[PDB]
Ligand binder design. Structure first.
Ligand SMILES: [K+]
Ligand SMILES: [K+]
Ligand SMILES: [K+]
Ligand SMILES: [K+]
Ligand SMILES: [K+]
Ligand SMILES: [K+]
Ligand SMILES: [K+]
Ligand SMILES: [K+]
Ligand SMILES: [K+]
Ligand SMILES: [Mg+2]
Ligand SMILES: [Mg+2]
Ligand SMILES: [Mg+2]
Ligand SMILES: [Mg+2]
Ligand SMILES: [Mg+2]
Ligand SMILES: [Mg+2]
Ligand SMILES: [Mg+2]
Ligand SMILES: [Mg+2]
Ligand SMILES: [Mg+2]
Ligand SMILES: [Mg+2]
Ligand SMILES: [Mg+2]
Ligand SMILES: [Mg+2]
Ligand SMILES: [Mg+2]
Ligand SMILES: [Mg+2]
Ligand SMILES: [Mg+2]
Ligand SMILES: [Mg+2]
Ligand SMILES: [Mg+2]
Ligand SMILES: [Mg+2]
Ligand SMILES: [Mg+2]
Ligand SMILES: [Mg+2]
Ligand SMILES: [Mg+2]
Ligand SMILES: [Mg+2]
Ligand SMILES: [Mg+2]
Ligand SMILES: [Mg+2]
Ligand SMILES: [Mg+2]
Ligand SMILES: [Mg+2]
Ligand SMILES: [Mg+2]
Ligand SMILES: [Mg+2]
Ligand SMILES: [Mg+2]
Ligand SMILES: [Mg+2]
Ligand SMILES: [Mg+2]
Ligand SMILES: [Mg+2]
Ligand SMILES: [Mg+2]
Ligand SMILES: [Mg+2]
Ligand SMILES: [Mg+2]
Ligand SMILES: [Mg+2]
Ligand SMILES: [Mg+2]
Ligand SMILES: [Mg+2]
Ligand SMILES: [Mg+2]
Length: 142
RNA sequence: AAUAAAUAAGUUUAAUACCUUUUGCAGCAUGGACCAGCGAUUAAAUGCCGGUAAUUAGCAAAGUUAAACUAACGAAAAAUA
RNA sequence: UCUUGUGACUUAACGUUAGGGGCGAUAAACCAAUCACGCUAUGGCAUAGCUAAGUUUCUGCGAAAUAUAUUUAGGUAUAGCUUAAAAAACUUUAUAGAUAAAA
RNA sequence: UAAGUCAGACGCAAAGCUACAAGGUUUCGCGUCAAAAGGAAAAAAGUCCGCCAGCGAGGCUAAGGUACAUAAA
RNA sequence: UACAAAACCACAACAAAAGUAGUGACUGUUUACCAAAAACACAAGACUCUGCUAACACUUAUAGUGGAAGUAUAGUGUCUGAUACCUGCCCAAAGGCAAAGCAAACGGCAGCUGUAACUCUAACGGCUCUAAGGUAGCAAAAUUCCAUGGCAUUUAAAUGAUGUCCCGCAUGAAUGGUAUAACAACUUCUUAACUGUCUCUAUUCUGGAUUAGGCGAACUUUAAAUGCUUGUGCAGAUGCAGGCUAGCUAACAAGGGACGAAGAGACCCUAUGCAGCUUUAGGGCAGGUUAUUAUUCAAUAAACUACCUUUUUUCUGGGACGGACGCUCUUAUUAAAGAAACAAGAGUGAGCAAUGGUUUUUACUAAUUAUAAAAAAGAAAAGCUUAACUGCAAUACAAACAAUUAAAGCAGGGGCAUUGUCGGCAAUAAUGCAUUGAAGAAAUA
RNA sequence: CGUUCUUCAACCAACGGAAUAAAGCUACGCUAGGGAUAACAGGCUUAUUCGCUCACAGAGUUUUAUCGACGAGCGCGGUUGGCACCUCGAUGUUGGAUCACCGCUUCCUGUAGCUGCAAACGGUUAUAAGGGUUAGACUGUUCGUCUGAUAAUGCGGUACGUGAUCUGAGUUCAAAGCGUCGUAAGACAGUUUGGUUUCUAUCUUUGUUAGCAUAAGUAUUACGGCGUUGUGUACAGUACGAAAGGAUUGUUGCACAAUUAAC
RNA sequence: AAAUACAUAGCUUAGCGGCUAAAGCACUGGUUUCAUAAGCCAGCUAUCAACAGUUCGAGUCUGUUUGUAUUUA
RNA sequence: AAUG
């Protein structure tokens, strides 16, 4: 009788000259209307995301067969295309997290603090429990 | 809705009670004839968040209960000799 | 005014059947002034997302009637709303050859 | 504020449903009422001007008015 | 028995019909306080059960009592309801009961098509299906939607009454069919007579009202000093705006308005609703019967009867009836996003062991529910493969929350290449929390 | 026996799914609430209905005498509808009896034109609301059919006027019968028989009367109320007309009927 | 106007995805009989309401336009 | 072995 499907927000998220950080989504589209340019990626559903720190750019290209192609680019901070820019981006990522924690305040906790320790698997932290809970380092050999 | 603001005291102008309930009530929606008396977030235990103090608390009386605290990276060199 | 008026009749005294019931030529009739479960005490200040009511004064601030979910639609929860000239940023899109200093 | 609210209404301007009807109904942009006294149009919730701490027989204006009712050519 | 009847007979008192149709035989009985009837009972008919410590009922029953101190021509239960003439077929399926049978137990009892001189009709044929296919009788009914059916009688005039025609929406034979003398404070129509019922009212008697003395209530009351008319307004004004209205207070009389008084609307819808009743809605066994087993009035129960307890959504241009409830695509509300109606137009609750991953070649550039995706990309062809992995993850989209969506990167073991890609499929749908249950492995006790 | 990891299944499609499971009747009904929500009446709207104008096609056949259309516009609030704004601590249902006020879209009684108007009987348009608008059979009816007369037997609004004035036949409680549907309780929106109608008038409106308030009598004018009706017949078998048929006119004459006023 | 079924040679009646077809009456020809009926033998009807879709392929599955019942207002 |  009635009914409606859940809405999908297709469209751009940033304009020309806006600053982005790695992992941020720039475009949500149902078809490949826009193609990935430099310093960007594309998901299996045609989601375009940034892969470095920089500013968003838009450009148009005319192909060999007379079709129009549209790209999305991310430009480095000072137009630095050298391979040394990657380490600068890594430092900026660490700094950005510190800025956010300072603004939010101490009472917005960003790590858990339980009365027990989480198990370790394959050298990383795991959220799955072991069959038995034991204190670390409270037993000797044999 | 019987009053109000004024006046040379003759009068002139302004002006559809209250409560409850509603998008909206002078309401042709609800309740009250009037007076006096009576008539409705109170007490205990526990928890959370502010305020005001003590500077651990209770017993006991040189010794015991309750609470609270208890490792995180030992990183500074400021000598006009 | 009308029906019956020796009969399946009417009347008086006393007695019998009691509510998870009795009685009934059945009308759900009657059982102490109106019974599809009598009266009284107790459980008991039953329960009511419904209607009604809520008692002195002054000062300051000040909404909503939408979204989602619901044995949910005149109820309730979450979000929303109301209380509690700083820093940072540059955005409504497209392009040229203009100088003349020295015997 | 771990509060109240989850019955809304109409004007101008658009669209769906109705019959390019309803003071109809469903969304949407602004405003007003709701919770807003005062002035103009006859009475005047939603239109036009404009937001009331108190008193006074001072003055200038808005919307709207300027032969009588009724202040001002 | 009942009815008609010219006429005849009466001191004063007492006085009130007949016929037609429908329904019940009759006299009786009933909703104390709106229904007296066609409803119930009734004499009578039939069916079934019961061998006597009878069946059955009361009761905790191991008692005791009624039945009955009766004994199948008797007693219990059920449906028909004097009397006269009658009372046809079916026990399949789903139940109940019983001696594998029972309908006067509870119930049922069709459709299509061709055919006789002109026509019409079908005496007469053909086919399908079922346990059986409604027989006689009666029939515009207390039963008929078309409807005030057609014809005749009745009247000056007939939605009336009686008679008659008839597959009758949806008649019908013991939930009986058709008739029937008598009887009826029952319903219907007609005749005689009579009359203030009426044309059309008038006069009068008795009592009240009305006048005077005495005695002395009740409903109701926010406050009142309470005009008309049109306009306005929670949409019908004594009280607001315009046009009008000028002696004062009552008595007797009428009843337009004060949305007049009395009873927190019964109708309708809405509830954390309540109650009674019904059943092949769920669960139980706690009386009897029945079945099995055991001791010299007992134990267990997927049965029948009785009893106890529980459930029987919401949305909705009021409710019921109908329809609908998850998830995708598209249309209008322009060219950011978002946006509702029981608005509109289409899909889906999967498929693929390759239609997945990856290399090479080229006279190819399609298709999907729908769609201007895509050329260093795809499709097809050829080869090798299982990444349709193990353990983690910065940062974002969205969003009340739950969950849902995209993803660089790190370690391990792999595939095809030979340093690139692979954590399923062009993309946008193919789904389900927690609980409970189950399987493989591992660690404890 | 318990815990963790890797996984799956059933009812959840009322698809945020849980009180394990799980249908109905009430006209014998009961309580708490709503005009937040229906049935009668009012309100808004005017699709539909109705009326008028333009249109003059087509029938009549010289005439737009008369009838009458496609299509468009405007108006009315009386037909069938839509909405849910007022009332559920109550705004009495259909028809009639009794007594009324208003509109004109005129049935009769009037005035003035046209005509396919000789007369008579008619047709149509404009204007006019003072008076009048009948007695009976059937039906609960509104309506409808019919009978004998009549100058004629008009329509609509007023809570589809009118129950604190009357009526209760229909519809709409509890009883009962028949048919159809349901296993049943029961239902009909089908039919049949029966079934309680309260009120002493405070305010306003209206008809009469008394007392009180400026002495009594006669009183032009003004103001208010009422409303001057209808049929037959004679003047005439004359006008008109081949015949048949058969008038107009009137401060007319006469008889009668209704209404009003008294006696 | 809603809701559940059905439209198959001349007439009843199989069939509901592999080609577009079964059975009985009727019709035609032959045989039997003096002749007509019954009885026997062989044949015949492109055998699938109408339109648009799905699919390699539809009487068969999905919609629309017509006709017929059945239930409801 | 129904009929003319
Ligand atoms: K007083
Ligand atoms: K008797
Ligand atoms: K019986
Ligand atoms: K009787
Ligand atoms: K009155
Ligand atoms: K409505
Ligand atoms: K649900
Ligand atoms: K009401
Ligand atoms: K006239
Ligand atoms: Mg659907
Ligand atoms: Mg209201
Ligand atoms: Mg009161
Ligand atoms: Mg009864
Ligand atoms: Mg403020
Ligand atoms: Mg639920
Ligand atoms: Mg709500
Ligand atoms: Mg709401
Ligand atoms: Mg509205
Ligand atoms: Mg409010
Ligand atoms: Mg000035
Ligand atoms: Mg002046
Ligand atoms: Mg009798
Ligand atoms: Mg008797
Ligand atoms: Mg009685
Ligand atoms: Mg009697
Ligand atoms: Mg009686
Ligand atoms: Mg008998
Ligand atoms: Mg019968
Ligand atoms: Mg009988
Ligand atoms: Mg007297
Ligand atoms: Mg008014
Ligand atoms: Mg007035
Ligand atoms: Mg009430
Ligand atoms: Mg509902
Ligand atoms: Mg979240
Ligand atoms: Mg590799
Ligand atoms: Mg992939
Ligand atoms: Mg009630
Ligand atoms: Mg309302
Ligand atoms: Mg509304
Ligand atoms: Mg006129
Ligand atoms: Mg009238
Ligand atoms: Mg009326
Ligand atoms: Mg009854
Ligand atoms: Mg019956
Ligand atoms: Mg039956
Ligand atoms: Mg009687
Ligand atoms: Mg013969």
């Amino acid at each position: 009788q009635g009914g409606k499907s859940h809405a999908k927000n297709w469209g751009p998220k940033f304009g020309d000259g806006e600053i982005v950080f790695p992992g941020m989504i720039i475009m949500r589209q149902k078809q490949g209307i826009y193609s990935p340019g430099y310093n960007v990626g594309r998901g299996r559903d045609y989601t375009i995301f940034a892969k470095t720190v920089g500013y968003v750019e838009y450009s148009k290209l005319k192909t060999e067969r007379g079709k129009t192609r549209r790209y999305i680019h991310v430009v480095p901070i000072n137009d630095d295309w050298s391979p040394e820019y990657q380490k600068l981006a890594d430092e900026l990522v660490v700094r950005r997290a510190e800025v956010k924690r300072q603004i939010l305040g101490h009472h917005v906790h960003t790590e858990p603090a339980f009365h027990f320790s989480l198990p370790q698997r394959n050298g990383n932290m795991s959220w799955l429990l072991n069959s038995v809970h034991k204190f670390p380092g409270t037993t000797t050999l044999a």
